[PDB]
Write an enzyme that holds these catalytic residues in place. Structure first.
Site, PDB file in Angstrom:
ATOM      1  N   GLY A   1      17.670  89.778  12.346  1.00 26.39           N
ATOM      2  CA  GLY A   1      17.701  89.503  11.395  1.00 26.39           C
ATOM      3  C   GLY A   1      17.894  91.105  10.065  1.00 26.39           C
ATOM      4  O   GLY A   1      18.169  91.197   9.677  1.00 26.39           O
TER       5      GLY A   1
ATOM      6  N   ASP B   1      33.739  88.933  12.419  1.00 23.92           N
ATOM      7  CA  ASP B   1      31.873  88.511  11.549  1.00 23.92           C
ATOM      8  C   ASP B   1      32.360  89.176  10.709  1.00 23.92           C
ATOM      9  O   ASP B   1      31.326  90.242  10.468  1.00 23.92           O
ATOM     10  CB  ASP B   1      31.131  88.799  12.790  1.00 23.92           C
ATOM     11  CG  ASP B   1      29.642  87.686  12.705  1.00 23.92           C
ATOM     12  OD1 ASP B   1      29.302  87.046  11.108  1.00 23.92           O
ATOM     13  OD2 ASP B   1      28.959  88.630  12.863  1.00 23.92           O
TER      14      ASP B   1
ATOM     15  N   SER C   1      21.320  91.600  10.720  1.00 18.60           N
ATOM     16  CA  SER C   1      22.961  91.425  10.827  1.00 18.60           C
ATOM     17  C   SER C   1      23.348  91.727   9.792  1.00 18.60           C
ATOM     18  O   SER C   1      22.315  91.836   8.465  1.00 18.60           O
ATOM     19  CB  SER C   1      23.107  89.816  11.307  1.00 18.60           C
ATOM     20  OG  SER C   1      22.549  89.871  12.851  1.00 18.60           O
TER      21      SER C   1
ATOM     22  N   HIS D   1      28.602  85.647   9.849  1.00 21.44           N
ATOM     23  CA  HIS D   1      26.975  84.618  10.208  1.00 21.44           C
ATOM     24  C   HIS D   1      26.027  84.047   9.595  1.00 21.44           C
ATOM     25  O   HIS D   1      25.662  83.259   9.468  1.00 21.44           O
ATOM     26  CB  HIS D   1      26.869  84.583  11.761  1.00 21.44           C
ATOM     27  CG  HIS D   1      25.892  86.103  11.854  1.00 21.44           C
ATOM     28  ND1 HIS D   1      26.022  86.668  12.445  1.00 21.44           N
ATOM     29  CD2 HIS D   1      24.322  85.111  11.494  1.00 21.44           C
ATOM     30  CE1 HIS D   1      25.370  87.826  12.735  1.00 21.44           C
ATOM     31  NE2 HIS D   1      24.328  86.393  12.719  1.00 21.44           N
TER      32      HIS D   1
HETATM   33  N1  11E Z   1      22.546  93.562  18.334  1.00 21.47           N
HETATM   34  C1  11E Z   1      21.956  92.686  18.325  1.00 21.47           C
HETATM   35  N2  11E Z   1      20.788  92.104  18.786  1.00 21.47           N
HETATM   36  C2  11E Z   1      21.104  90.350  18.308  1.00 21.47           C
HETATM   37  C3  11E Z   1      19.411  89.402  19.320  1.00 21.47           C
HETATM   38  C4  11E Z   1      19.513  88.385  18.390  1.00 21.47           C
HETATM   39  C5  11E Z   1      20.207  88.206  17.042  1.00 21.47           C
HETATM   40  C6  11E Z   1      20.105  86.743  16.321  1.00 21.47           C
HETATM   41  O1  11E Z   1      20.300  86.154  17.200  1.00 21.47           O
HETATM   42  N3  11E Z   1      19.514  87.219  14.995  1.00 21.47           N
HETATM   43  C7  11E Z   1      19.226  86.011  14.520  1.00 21.47           C
HETATM   44  C8  11E Z   1      20.030  87.089  13.466  1.00 21.47           C
HETATM   45  O2  11E Z   1      21.496  87.420  13.277  1.00 21.47           O
HETATM   46  O3  11E Z   1      18.997  87.545  12.558  1.00 21.47           O
HETATM   47  C9  11E Z   1      21.137  89.435  16.130  1.00 21.47           C
HETATM   48  C10 11E Z   1      20.995  90.305  17.358  1.00 21.47           C
HETATM   49  S1  11E Z   1      22.418  91.944  16.576  1.00 21.47           S
END
Ligand code: 11E
Length: 247
Positions: A196, A97, A198, A46
């Site tokens: 961020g 993913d 991820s 992703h």
């Molecule tokens: N444990 C996680 N909570 C979230 C909330 C939001 C997002 C998100 O939208 N991330 C954008 C990105 O991938 O950086 C990723 C996560 S992973």
């Protein structure tokens, strides 16, 4: 990383910082990843799906800071961006993913290990810690959900593994979560992964070795009650990883 603490790359020497070049030439941060061997970084698909072209990406190893260079860091290009053919994105849930980036320097070499750059072991097949186990997560993601900025200093925190069964519930994620995913969270929903983070590591001590159990993948918000962070369950993708990291 919501809560937790500041760290340096010595405490997570396999962490990779992935950036992308924009047309016009600004460089912006994308996601984390984990070095699994000299030439291979593992991350989430992703992070990449919208810009699948391997010449826009830059990967740093040995780097503790977001927008400043760390002494002894290595900078790489992506000789190779490998996205999981079966990827799928629902509103929240991302399936399969997982992504491999084959790294190479301008001088055409892979990672040379050091005090700040080492590799992380994969788990052996279908082998994960029991629920309630404490693991660590690392990244440059937001410190609070409302933040605009990302931390300039790398961070980590501790979250505990949640059973397939707990995470299964309605008030949690229902069927958004599969056996190819892992849930993990704080008992006070106090600390978490966030935007961020991820692509980076969930590392659990498994048979007394530091093991790449999960890859930050998704969640609804961050550090929200009944809303754990969701991680790609690495121990269900070893054949994919094994096949894709060769010749
Ligand atoms: N444990 C996680 N909570 C979230 C909330 C939001 C997002 C998100 O939208 N991330 C954008 C990105 O991938 O950086 C990723 C996560 S992973």
């Amino acid at each position: 990383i919501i809560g937790g603490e500041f760290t340096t790359i010595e405490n997570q020497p396999w962490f990779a910082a992935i950036y992308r070049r924009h047309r016009g030439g600004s460089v912006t941060y994308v996601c984390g990843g984990s070095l699994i061997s000299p030439c291979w970084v593992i991350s989430a698909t992703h992070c990449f799906i919208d810009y699948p072209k391997k010449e826009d990406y830059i990967v740093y190893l040995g780097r503790s800071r977001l927008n400043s260079n760390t002494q002894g860091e290595m900078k790489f290009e992506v000789e190779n961006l490998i996205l999981h053919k079966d990827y799928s994105a629902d509103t929240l849930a991302h399936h399969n993913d997982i992504a491999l980036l084959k790294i190479r320097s301008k001088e055409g070499r892979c990672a040379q290990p050091s005090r700040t750059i080492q590799t992380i072991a994969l788990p052996s097949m279908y082998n994960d810690p029991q629920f309630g186990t404490s693991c660590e997560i690392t990244g440059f993601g937001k410190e609070q959900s409302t933040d605009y900025l990302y931390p300039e200093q790398l961070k980590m925190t501790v979250v505990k593994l949640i059973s397939h069964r707990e995470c299964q519930q309605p008030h949690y994620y229902g069927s958004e979560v599969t056996t190819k995913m892992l849930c993990a969270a704080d008992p006070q929903w106090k600390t978490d992964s966030c935007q961020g983070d991820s692509g980076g590591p969930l590392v659990c001590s498994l048979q007394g070795r530091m093991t790449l159990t999960g890859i930050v993948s998704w969640g609804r918000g961050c550090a929200l009650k009944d809303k754990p962070g969701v991680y790609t369950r690495v121990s269900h993708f070893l054949p994919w990883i094994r096949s894709h990291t060769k010749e």
